[PDB]
Amino acid sequence: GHMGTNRPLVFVDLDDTLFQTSRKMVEGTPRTTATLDVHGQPNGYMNPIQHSFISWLLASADVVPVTARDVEAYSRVKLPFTEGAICSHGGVMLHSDGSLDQDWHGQMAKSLWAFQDRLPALSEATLRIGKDMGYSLRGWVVEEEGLRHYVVTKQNESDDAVLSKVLAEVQARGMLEGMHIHANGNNLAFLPKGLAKRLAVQEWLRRDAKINGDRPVLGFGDSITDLGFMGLCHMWATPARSQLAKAVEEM
Amino acid sequence: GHMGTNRPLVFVDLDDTLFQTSRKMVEGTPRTTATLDVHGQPNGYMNPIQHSFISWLLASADVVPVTARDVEAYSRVKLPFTEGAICSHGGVMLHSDGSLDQDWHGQMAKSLWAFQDRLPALSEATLRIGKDMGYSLRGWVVEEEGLRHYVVTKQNESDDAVLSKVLAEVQARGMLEGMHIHANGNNLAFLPKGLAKRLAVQEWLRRDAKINGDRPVLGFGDSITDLGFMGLCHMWATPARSQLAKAVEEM
Ligand SMILES: [Ca+2]
Ligand SMILES: [Ca+2]
Hints:
The structure is a homodimer of 251-residue chains.
Chain A: E1 9-12, E2 32-36, E3 42-46, H1 48-60, E4 62-65, H2 71-75, E5 85-87, E6 92-94, H3 102-112, H4 118-132, E7 137-143, E8 148-155, H5 161-172, E9 179-183, E10 188-192, H6 197-212, E11 217-220, H7 227-230, E12 235-239, H8 243-250
Parallel strand pairs in A: 1-4, 1-11, 11-12
Antiparallel strand pairs in A: 2-3, 5-6, 7-8, 8-10, 9-10
The complex binds calcium ion (CA) (2 copies).
One calcium ion is lined by residues 13, 15-17, 222-223 of chain B.
PDB class: lyase
Keywords: HAD superfamily/rossmann fold, trehalose-6-phosphate, phosphohydrolase, hydrolase, lyase
Assembly: dimeric
């Protein structure tokens, strides 16, 4: 029989799914501010279709962000999400009021302690190996309070092909055993095995079923690696020109 | 500025997207009748998630079916669609009251007259070539009032691999120049160039933009060939275990 709410539970990726930076939109296109930079100035935008879509979705369903952004970067997303969030590539769950989920934090700590030294080592070694190939890079360890989650690397050449090369050699030098990777645009991330949007969404669904039983679950994402959590949903969806959609086109 | 409605326009495939036959569900699964057979008895069903999902979508957006079913087979779909429909693989548009769109019918007649003799010929030749390979087949020409649209072929062996073989030889014998194909499950269809869900959805959008301007467009489909019309949408979506999703998994 029926228990709780029967409205869809919708997991949405953020960057390049609901909004994007100015460089990724045609100049002069009308836009609404969706995110701020660390200096507090607008830096991510929705075009009119994107704003209409997320407004409709937020009013019609229970919408939960599922994002690579860490908690601080998620706090610069200026969209009125009301159901909590999954952040840091599934390393963090936030309650509806934005406070940290202590249970998940404990479980993630358990999956990640064996990596706490390797992640700063791997970032420094990646940034050195890139400077040795002549590429001006930029990188850091993404970390919640205390706990280090994953390594991110970007390039300063206006040439995303650089990162695919670095990925090739790091893979060769064997530096990525026991880890998985995300690459989309000017972003190359190395993730420990127990860190994945899929794992956090799986737990979110386990909790939801105890309150609301089985209700429709929709997943929206733009990256090929978003297929991890999207495959847990009853239906999954992608923007027409996403990395995922372009790969499907080529198939 | 804003004109008309800003709710999403959602194009939905029908069979294996919103419902399916009993053979495609686990026995004993709870179900709701979605379609009737030609004898008027239930033959397609929604599971509880599917019923909740379409009910939510119909209440939340303007939902337009986009189906291979001809008008008569569409009339045996027992879902309360209120905005009209695209039928017969894009060969037919129906108004909200179910009457035929005369403009599109004229345009389709134009694209299809060069095929009116070839389609009965191609069906008969396919059913003969299959009987020559030892396969018990079944096939016919799908036709609206007067106008023949496309050829469909099914097998009676409980072995959908049969149809891929027939497709291989028909392709060899050159019988499919100027046409495109659909294959999913126990269904192999040969479509003239000017017959496609994509073309009808493209026209539906052209008409809608004059009334409602640019509003979010979502497309839902299960078949690889549904990517045609789904690529016209701002976002497209698919069931987790669809033919499309399985192909994406393999990629
Ligand atoms: Ca993204
Ligand atoms: Ca279908």
